[PDB]
């Protein structure tokens, strides 16, 4: 996302041989809980529901926000996966409860990091 | 890491500096960039290339404070110069990067290092890029069209005046970048 | 809820003959469920899915606030997640952290029967009740 | 893409959304294979079996022939079935009945359809062990659809045959509203 | 609270011989909790149930504000709701005793369901 | 349903809600059987026993005869007791006293009621001051309620008898 | 923070031998991915030289929305804020170790300022 | 504790009293301050000093209610006196702190305790004698030289002091 801002240090070392797109916070209404994140944060994994174009089907013209009638809790993880690279398994939620959800948002079962794919094994 | 100083002492607005800080704070939460982070921060830059060696040259192009590691304030001045500074400033900045051992002189020896270090960062072999232009026949074009009197040694004034003469290396430099 | 939109593919295959049960409509609103503070939101239809349970039914009319223009429940907002989520996916899940008693109490209130719990959780609902 | 679908179908953006949310829930997958197709009707009727019908419904699509049915197929299908011209809605039904895709419906494959729907609904459930056999139902169809009596019903035969039918016609127009 | 409304059925059987409610708003670190005033009144002589909470009322924001953890507060509020105080089988013991001490709730008014688990990890 | 209850009882929608929230808390159940009924009075009085009275209160309802008492029964009952005509309020008490539902109250069953309340309330069925005997309490009732002296009190006897009582009427309105 | 208000009881006992006035208190609003956290400014000031406690947070303030916004996980943030509240940093015996170390590193809180109650469980699953 | 009483019966506004309460409620959630909390509440006051002994003198400078422990209301009156009260009141308050055994008399014996107790709290930076500090006090406070300083002696003595009067009036916001 903000790695773009490091490239000019590269471009600098070429010299001698060899607007932008302003950012918004977008508002993800989830059964009530109003989640907020930087547009870029979502763009990080395009070709997954939020990262992609698909979410346009959940945008409300009036409320001026994306709304999903899904569980707000699991959505924490999904969002947090866009944030740190890692998708974590909440060692409390039911396996089935949260696979269902991963299948919806377009995230694959075991992009789960090493910390949690351990516990994702021992109770699935 | 004071924000309103940075606003005054660089070419960035508070708004911009924030975006930059959030950029930085994410590429290392650390707050302090050592060479290793520096290296792996470019691991992304290119797919299957190796920017290991260039990371090193980029690193001790900073340490201008000489405090072992590079803090954010260094990072933003650098950028303030590279994206907003005077041609002279932007140019002097590149010169210091090329002058590896800090002595105000660039020789064939160390220019080769740089060009190899960047070629590595991309694909002068990385399967498909299959490059052919040597790292040698590239330094040579540089010196033969930068080292004015042909003493095999290029100085800052030689490099400055040489690039001003170059219509294209000039409008590249200036084209207004956008940190936002 | 949105299964209604698949029935025309069935109704299509009748044309030319045809007892039967492959027969404007009504609206759709999001309704607002205020629960101790946490303002839950769901599609009206989502609730209608299990009528004869508190929210699914007419009963909830007793919890509607004329002014605030919302349903308000002075119950625990947490367990309410499961109750709402049961209307959403078919499955009622047992949160493997909450106290059994804490959440039976609540199921009894909203009109949901103890073990409509899916196979995933009626396992754990057993081993600590 | 949403604003294509709006242009290239009879639905408004609003409607298409509802439809998408409908689809995205019946399979998060985004791609409907036959198995999802089957169990998506498991609900349709209580204790009936729509397994065999699911198959006929499935390769009524695959019009793209990309192994599976994507949402855009599903919404065109619906745009035709709920909004399209009588001709369009009718041709759609014909293609469903013409199992092997050859523009001809014969007693053989009409039997399949009727049995396949009877199965879905449940002839023996609690009505009575077949109201009429699927046989005496194909027969009424052909004897009142196959115009010249060659035992083979073509699209034009089926089209012109249904326009003549005051009621098959009202059933086909009555304005459905997704929403 | 609403038991008063059952008494006339008693008073009825004597015959022949013998002011309103608000929801109050509990701002907790941000999370705006809401409950019926009566709900709190149920155990007076505990912070919320009592007069003490007047010290946490904000004239302007027009709400009670507590710079405490919003999570544990769930249980405390829920104790006013059903009679039972539950121990969240995830939170740290110390984390939640601290809080019980603040709101004026005694360590083991905990129901039989949870005073089991409150034992085995304290 | 709420707007029916508004129409078919003396309560406003506002009122009916508070009543419902009242009810829905005394049993989440939604259906009150006798056991909930009993323990709902366990509070009513500190160390008294309202077990036996609960029973009489219970089959004072079951007017629908559906095994248990639903909320709607509860609010009509209350609508009568708090807002109804004197007649209605009085007939309501009479049906409570007439345990076996036959329109007749006899010494036998009035004793039951008075004992059943004494038990609830905690009072002795044998005090220091003798005038308190609930035998000696049914007696005052009948000797000042049973008009002819046939030892049996009917609804009309009970109705007319209470209208005559200047306080068991003010008791019965404000 | 409010220990200053006890110092005059000391100063009183001297009698017989032996921003000056420009800071009020505000609640500040910490927007975290949505969940709007609220705390007393002083509460944060309690550990300066940690992101919120310090000047660093100025980089996360939004001029318009008039609040600090963090695109971090709102849940872990609870602990981080709660650490400023009671002295103690607790390990939520449900969250993933990694998930929450990552977060501690961001906000400038050191791994084991964890109290004795939780540095027990922080051990047995790290 | 009740807030609008305190507002009336002390010199603080509701606003102020709240801040004070939130201050108090954090130094002990307890709500009740015994001597041990009292001691450790000064553990911070100074880095490596010991206010253990002073805590004790501070404690039974309260217990004015004599209810074993010091409630918040005591704490705010105390402060209302110390930050806002009349010179007389502020002075009388100090006198009661110095008069350890509550008899209205301060003698060399107990003044030494106080000074030592504060020295301990502070740096147990220093050159002023311990004894040679009570002496300066008495020789410039005990008017007639009977070695005993009374309230009136202490009052009139401090009013004369053209800086111990500025020590007292100058300073108060909560
Ligand atoms: Ca050199
Ligand atoms: Ca040269
Ligand atoms: Ca054919
Ligand atoms: Ca033919
Ligand atoms: Ca009878
Ligand atoms: Ca009679
Ligand atoms: Ca003395
Ligand atoms: Ca004297
Ligand atoms: Na600037
Ligand atoms: Na259209
Ligand atoms: Na009415
Ligand atoms: Na005052
Ligand atoms: Zn993890
Ligand atoms: Zn489950
Ligand atoms: Zn429990
Ligand atoms: Zn802990």
mmCIF file of N, CA and C in Angstrom, chain A residues 9-94:
data_model
loop_
_atom_site.group_PDB
_atom_site.id
_atom_site.type_symbol
_atom_site.label_atom_id
_atom_site.label_comp_id
_atom_site.label_asym_id
_atom_site.label_seq_id
_atom_site.Cartn_x
_atom_site.Cartn_y
_atom_site.Cartn_z
ATOM 1 N N UNK A 9 13.423 6.098 -4.047
ATOM 2 C CA UNK A 9 14.796 5.843 -3.603
ATOM 3 C C UNK A 9 15.441 4.893 -4.570
ATOM 4 N N UNK A 10 14.644 4.004 -5.148
ATOM 5 C CA UNK A 10 15.140 3.194 -6.259
ATOM 6 C C UNK A 10 15.313 4.078 -7.505
ATOM 7 N N UNK A 11 14.218 4.697 -7.971
ATOM 8 C CA UNK A 11 14.284 5.486 -9.194
ATOM 9 C C UNK A 11 15.487 6.454 -9.154
ATOM 10 N N UNK A 12 15.881 6.887 -7.962
ATOM 11 C CA UNK A 12 17.012 7.811 -7.830
ATOM 12 C C UNK A 12 18.336 7.234 -8.349
ATOM 13 N N UNK A 13 18.544 5.929 -8.162
ATOM 14 C CA UNK A 13 19.828 5.310 -8.502
ATOM 15 C C UNK A 13 19.973 4.948 -9.990
ATOM 16 N N UNK A 14 18.906 5.160 -10.768
ATOM 17 C CA UNK A 14 18.932 4.973 -12.226
ATOM 18 C C UNK A 14 19.562 6.174 -12.927
ATOM 19 N N UNK A 15 19.061 7.396 -12.637
ATOM 20 C CA UNK A 15 19.599 8.688 -13.157
ATOM 21 C C UNK A 15 21.083 8.639 -13.614
ATOM 22 N N UNK A 16 21.314 8.656 -14.916
ATOM 23 C CA UNK A 16 22.682 8.622 -15.433
ATOM 24 C C UNK A 16 22.924 7.512 -16.451
ATOM 25 N N UNK A 17 21.939 6.630 -16.588
ATOM 26 C CA UNK A 17 21.984 5.472 -17.490
ATOM 27 C C UNK A 17 20.528 4.929 -17.647
ATOM 28 N N UNK A 18 20.395 3.610 -17.823
ATOM 29 C CA UNK A 18 19.096 2.933 -17.848
ATOM 30 C C UNK A 18 18.387 3.104 -19.207
ATOM 31 N N UNK A 19 -2.706 13.269 -11.998
ATOM 32 C CA UNK A 19 -2.434 13.129 -10.550
ATOM 33 C C UNK A 19 -2.277 11.649 -10.112
ATOM 34 N N UNK A 20 -2.361 11.437 -8.783
ATOM 35 C CA UNK A 20 -2.364 10.087 -8.200
ATOM 36 C C UNK A 20 -3.789 9.506 -8.152
ATOM 37 N N UNK A 21 -4.234 9.072 -6.964
ATOM 38 C CA UNK A 21 -5.603 8.570 -6.765
ATOM 39 C C UNK A 21 -6.054 8.656 -5.293
ATOM 40 N N UNK A 22 -6.286 9.880 -4.792
ATOM 41 C CA UNK A 22 -6.553 10.147 -3.353
ATOM 42 C C UNK A 22 -7.389 9.085 -2.642
ATOM 43 N N UNK A 23 -7.005 8.814 -1.403
ATOM 44 C CA UNK A 23 -7.543 7.716 -0.589
ATOM 45 C C UNK A 23 -8.764 8.121 0.273
ATOM 46 N N UNK A 24 -9.709 7.202 0.447
ATOM 47 C CA UNK A 24 -10.878 7.409 1.314
ATOM 48 C C UNK A 24 -10.908 6.301 2.349
ATOM 49 N N UNK A 25 -11.554 6.555 3.495
ATOM 50 C CA UNK A 25 -11.991 5.456 4.358
ATOM 51 C C UNK A 25 -13.331 5.021 3.821
ATOM 52 N N UNK A 26 -13.522 3.713 3.714
ATOM 53 C CA UNK A 26 -14.809 3.198 3.296
ATOM 54 C C UNK A 26 -15.458 2.569 4.503
ATOM 55 N N UNK A 27 -16.780 2.479 4.470
ATOM 56 C CA UNK A 27 -17.546 2.176 5.652
ATOM 57 C C UNK A 27 -18.238 0.873 5.416
ATOM 58 N N UNK A 28 -17.887 -0.133 6.198
ATOM 59 C CA UNK A 28 -18.514 -1.414 6.013
ATOM 60 C C UNK A 28 -19.481 -1.691 7.139
ATOM 61 N N UNK A 29 -20.770 -1.509 6.862
ATOM 62 C CA UNK A 29 -21.849 -1.781 7.808
ATOM 63 C C UNK A 29 -22.083 -3.291 7.918
ATOM 64 N N UNK A 30 -21.879 -3.884 9.086
ATOM 65 C CA UNK A 30 -22.059 -5.345 9.157
ATOM 66 C C UNK A 30 -23.058 -5.723 10.221
ATOM 67 N N UNK A 31 -24.299 -5.901 9.784
ATOM 68 C CA UNK A 31 -25.428 -6.230 10.653
ATOM 69 C C UNK A 31 -25.701 -5.134 11.686
ATOM 70 N N UNK A 32 -25.057 -3.986 11.502
ATOM 71 C CA UNK A 32 -25.116 -2.961 12.505
ATOM 72 C C UNK A 32 -23.754 -2.374 12.765
ATOM 73 N N UNK A 33 -22.787 -3.192 13.198
ATOM 74 C CA UNK A 33 -21.437 -2.695 13.515
ATOM 75 C C UNK A 33 -20.893 -1.991 12.295
ATOM 76 N N UNK A 34 -20.579 -0.709 12.426
ATOM 77 C CA UNK A 34 -20.051 0.059 11.308
ATOM 78 C C UNK A 34 -18.552 -0.007 11.296
ATOM 79 N N UNK A 35 -18.008 -0.927 10.491
ATOM 80 C CA UNK A 35 -16.549 -1.052 10.280
ATOM 81 C C UNK A 35 -16.025 0.026 9.348
ATOM 82 N N UNK A 36 -14.796 0.456 9.613
ATOM 83 C CA UNK A 36 -14.146 1.458 8.774
ATOM 84 C C UNK A 36 -12.713 1.076 8.443
ATOM 85 N N UNK A 37 -12.342 1.287 7.191
ATOM 86 C CA UNK A 37 -11.018 0.953 6.766
ATOM 87 C C UNK A 37 -10.659 1.815 5.577
ATOM 88 N N UNK A 38 -9.354 1.923 5.322
ATOM 89 C CA UNK A 38 -8.792 2.621 4.169
ATOM 90 C C UNK A 38 -8.993 1.835 2.891
ATOM 91 N N UNK A 39 -9.426 2.518 1.843
ATOM 92 C CA UNK A 39 -9.806 1.840 0.608
ATOM 93 C C UNK A 39 -8.680 0.917 0.150
ATOM 94 N N UNK A 40 -7.474 1.462 0.173
ATOM 95 C CA UNK A 40 -6.280 0.716 -0.145
ATOM 96 C C UNK A 40 -6.152 -0.587 0.639
ATOM 97 N N UNK A 41 -6.503 -0.560 1.924
ATOM 98 C CA UNK A 41 -6.444 -1.764 2.746
ATOM 99 C C UNK A 41 -7.193 -2.898 2.078
ATOM 100 N N UNK A 42 -8.355 -2.602 1.491
ATOM 101 C CA UNK A 42 -9.151 -3.638 0.847
ATOM 102 C C UNK A 42 -8.538 -4.050 -0.468
ATOM 103 N N UNK A 43 -8.078 -3.059 -1.221
ATOM 104 C CA UNK A 43 -7.498 -3.266 -2.539
ATOM 105 C C UNK A 43 -6.326 -4.243 -2.510
ATOM 106 N N UNK A 44 -5.819 -4.516 -1.318
ATOM 107 C CA UNK A 44 -4.621 -5.333 -1.136
ATOM 108 C C UNK A 44 -4.765 -6.760 -1.657
ATOM 109 N N UNK A 45 -5.955 -7.333 -1.544
ATOM 110 C CA UNK A 45 -6.187 -8.632 -2.123
ATOM 111 C C UNK A 45 -7.327 -8.472 -3.070
ATOM 112 N N UNK A 46 -7.069 -7.975 -4.299
ATOM 113 C CA UNK A 46 -8.220 -7.891 -5.174
ATOM 114 C C UNK A 46 -8.553 -9.321 -5.525
ATOM 115 N N UNK A 47 -9.695 -9.527 -6.164
ATOM 116 C CA UNK A 47 -10.214 -10.879 -6.445
ATOM 117 C C UNK A 47 -10.674 -11.662 -5.187
ATOM 118 N N UNK A 48 -10.896 -10.925 -4.103
ATOM 119 C CA UNK A 48 -11.674 -11.441 -2.991
ATOM 120 C C UNK A 48 -12.762 -10.411 -2.762
ATOM 121 N N UNK A 49 -13.989 -10.891 -2.492
ATOM 122 C CA UNK A 49 -15.199 -10.045 -2.345
ATOM 123 C C UNK A 49 -14.987 -8.539 -2.099
ATOM 124 N N UNK A 50 -14.372 -8.179 -0.970
ATOM 125 C CA UNK A 50 -14.159 -6.754 -0.679
ATOM 126 C C UNK A 50 -13.041 -6.159 -1.509
ATOM 127 N N UNK A 51 -11.972 -6.922 -1.684
ATOM 128 C CA UNK A 51 -10.858 -6.458 -2.489
ATOM 129 C C UNK A 51 -11.252 -6.229 -3.933
ATOM 130 N N UNK A 52 -12.336 -6.865 -4.344
ATOM 131 C CA UNK A 52 -12.684 -6.847 -5.741
ATOM 132 C C UNK A 52 -13.801 -5.863 -6.061
ATOM 133 N N UNK A 53 -14.414 -6.095 -7.226
ATOM 134 C CA UNK A 53 -15.539 -5.348 -7.748
ATOM 135 C C UNK A 53 -16.848 -5.886 -7.162
ATOM 136 N N UNK A 54 -16.837 -7.155 -6.760
ATOM 137 C CA UNK A 54 -18.025 -7.839 -6.278
ATOM 138 C C UNK A 54 -18.785 -7.020 -5.262
ATOM 139 N N UNK A 55 -18.069 -6.430 -4.316
ATOM 140 C CA UNK A 55 -18.715 -5.662 -3.230
ATOM 141 C C UNK A 55 -19.665 -4.582 -3.731
ATOM 142 N N UNK A 56 -19.545 -4.222 -5.000
ATOM 143 C CA UNK A 56 -20.404 -3.186 -5.515
ATOM 144 C C UNK A 56 -21.859 -3.615 -5.385
ATOM 145 N N UNK A 57 -22.090 -4.933 -5.349
ATOM 146 C CA UNK A 57 -23.444 -5.489 -5.235
ATOM 147 C C UNK A 57 -24.003 -5.347 -3.839
ATOM 148 N N UNK A 58 -23.208 -4.839 -2.899
ATOM 149 C CA UNK A 58 -23.658 -4.705 -1.522
ATOM 150 C C UNK A 58 -23.628 -3.262 -1.106
ATOM 151 N N UNK A 59 -23.454 -2.361 -2.058
ATOM 152 C CA UNK A 59 -23.393 -0.941 -1.743
ATOM 153 C C UNK A 59 -24.787 -0.379 -1.689
ATOM 154 N N UNK A 60 -25.057 0.407 -0.670
ATOM 155 C CA UNK A 60 -26.331 1.067 -0.580
ATOM 156 C C UNK A 60 -26.201 2.522 -1.012
ATOM 157 N N UNK A 61 -26.952 2.878 -2.049
ATOM 158 C CA UNK A 61 -26.967 4.223 -2.607
ATOM 159 C C UNK A 61 -27.300 5.291 -1.560
ATOM 160 N N UNK A 62 -28.360 5.015 -0.789
ATOM 161 C CA UNK A 62 -28.872 5.905 0.250
ATOM 162 C C UNK A 62 -27.921 5.958 1.450
ATOM 163 N N UNK A 63 -27.924 4.892 2.242
ATOM 164 C CA UNK A 63 -27.071 4.827 3.417
ATOM 165 C C UNK A 63 -25.626 5.164 3.062
ATOM 166 N N UNK A 64 -25.320 5.186 1.766
ATOM 167 C CA UNK A 64 -23.997 5.505 1.237
ATOM 168 C C UNK A 64 -22.903 4.629 1.840
ATOM 169 N N UNK A 65 -23.200 3.346 2.035
ATOM 170 C CA UNK A 65 -22.250 2.398 2.654
ATOM 171 C C UNK A 65 -22.459 0.948 2.213
ATOM 172 N N UNK A 66 -21.393 0.169 2.263
ATOM 173 C CA UNK A 66 -21.525 -1.256 2.029
ATOM 174 C C UNK A 66 -22.195 -1.885 3.256
ATOM 175 N N UNK A 67 -23.221 -2.700 3.031
ATOM 176 C CA UNK A 67 -23.908 -3.399 4.106
ATOM 177 C C UNK A 67 -23.933 -4.892 3.862
ATOM 178 N N UNK A 68 -23.560 -5.680 4.879
ATOM 179 C CA UNK A 68 -23.590 -7.142 4.787
ATOM 180 C C UNK A 68 -24.367 -7.696 5.962
ATOM 181 N N UNK A 69 -25.338 -8.547 5.681
ATOM 182 C CA UNK A 69 -26.208 -9.093 6.718
ATOM 183 C C UNK A 69 -25.520 -10.325 7.240
ATOM 184 N N UNK A 70 -24.216 -10.244 7.400
ATOM 185 C CA UNK A 70 -23.484 -11.383 7.944
ATOM 186 C C UNK A 70 -23.175 -11.104 9.419
ATOM 187 N N UNK A 71 -22.575 -12.106 10.065
ATOM 188 C CA UNK A 71 -22.093 -12.026 11.427
ATOM 189 C C UNK A 71 -21.014 -10.964 11.516
ATOM 190 N N UNK A 72 -21.132 -10.039 12.482
ATOM 191 C CA UNK A 72 -20.161 -8.963 12.571
ATOM 192 C C UNK A 72 -18.876 -9.432 13.176
ATOM 193 N N UNK A 73 -18.956 -10.419 14.061
ATOM 194 C CA UNK A 73 -17.762 -10.922 14.699
ATOM 195 C C UNK A 73 -16.735 -11.518 13.752
ATOM 196 N N UNK A 74 -17.125 -12.493 12.949
ATOM 197 C CA UNK A 74 -16.145 -13.159 12.093
ATOM 198 C C UNK A 74 -15.498 -12.170 11.147
ATOM 199 N N UNK A 75 -16.323 -11.252 10.666
ATOM 200 C CA UNK A 75 -15.873 -10.143 9.832
ATOM 201 C C UNK A 75 -14.649 -9.380 10.373
ATOM 202 N N UNK A 76 -14.491 -9.307 11.698
ATOM 203 C CA UNK A 76 -13.248 -8.806 12.299
ATOM 204 C C UNK A 76 -12.035 -9.472 11.680
ATOM 205 N N UNK A 77 -12.072 -10.792 11.599
ATOM 206 C CA UNK A 77 -10.905 -11.511 11.145
ATOM 207 C C UNK A 77 -10.706 -11.233 9.701
ATOM 208 N N UNK A 78 -11.775 -11.361 8.938
ATOM 209 C CA UNK A 78 -11.684 -11.081 7.529
ATOM 210 C C UNK A 78 -11.060 -9.710 7.315
ATOM 211 N N UNK A 79 -11.522 -8.685 8.024
ATOM 212 C CA UNK A 79 -10.952 -7.361 7.834
ATOM 213 C C UNK A 79 -9.511 -7.349 8.264
ATOM 214 N N UNK A 80 -9.253 -7.893 9.440
ATOM 215 C CA UNK A 80 -7.885 -7.973 9.946
ATOM 216 C C UNK A 80 -6.880 -8.732 9.106
ATOM 217 N N UNK A 81 -7.366 -9.631 8.265
ATOM 218 C CA UNK A 81 -6.549 -10.280 7.267
ATOM 219 C C UNK A 81 -6.108 -9.287 6.187
ATOM 220 N N UNK A 82 -6.962 -8.332 5.820
ATOM 221 C CA UNK A 82 -6.548 -7.328 4.850
ATOM 222 C C UNK A 82 -5.526 -6.404 5.476
ATOM 223 N N UNK A 83 -5.573 -6.291 6.798
ATOM 224 C CA UNK A 83 -4.720 -5.357 7.537
ATOM 225 C C UNK A 83 -3.278 -5.844 7.758
ATOM 226 N N UNK A 84 -3.040 -6.764 8.700
ATOM 227 C CA UNK A 84 -1.806 -7.581 8.663
ATOM 228 C C UNK A 84 -2.019 -8.646 7.622
ATOM 229 N N UNK A 85 -0.945 -9.140 7.018
ATOM 230 C CA UNK A 85 -1.098 -10.196 6.023
ATOM 231 C C UNK A 85 -1.845 -11.424 6.538
ATOM 232 N N UNK A 86 -1.804 -11.625 7.855
ATOM 233 C CA UNK A 86 -2.187 -12.904 8.456
ATOM 234 C C UNK A 86 -3.706 -13.048 8.690
ATOM 235 N N UNK A 87 -4.247 -14.212 8.318
ATOM 236 C CA UNK A 87 -5.600 -14.604 8.697
ATOM 237 C C UNK A 87 -5.540 -15.499 9.901
ATOM 238 N N UNK A 88 -6.177 -15.055 10.977
ATOM 239 C CA UNK A 88 -6.110 -15.763 12.247
ATOM 240 C C UNK A 88 -7.388 -16.539 12.528
ATOM 241 N N UNK A 89 -7.229 -17.716 13.145
ATOM 242 C CA UNK A 89 -8.371 -18.484 13.616
ATOM 243 C C UNK A 89 -8.651 -18.144 15.073
ATOM 244 N N UNK A 90 -9.770 -17.429 15.327
ATOM 245 C CA UNK A 90 -10.239 -17.122 16.685
ATOM 246 C C UNK A 90 -10.507 -18.388 17.550
ATOM 247 N N UNK A 91 -9.568 -18.751 18.428
ATOM 248 C CA UNK A 91 -9.595 -20.058 19.149
ATOM 249 C C UNK A 91 -10.826 -20.283 20.057
ATOM 250 N N UNK A 92 -11.928 -19.620 19.701
ATOM 251 C CA UNK A 92 -13.200 -19.721 20.423
ATOM 252 C C UNK A 92 -14.379 -20.050 19.494
ATOM 253 N N UNK A 93 -14.439 -19.372 18.350
ATOM 254 C CA UNK A 93 -15.520 -19.553 17.382
ATOM 255 C C UNK A 93 -15.569 -20.984 16.860
ATOM 256 N N UNK A 94 -16.742 -21.394 16.394
ATOM 257 C CA UNK A 94 -16.906 -22.718 15.822
ATOM 258 C C UNK A 94 -16.313 -22.769 14.414
#
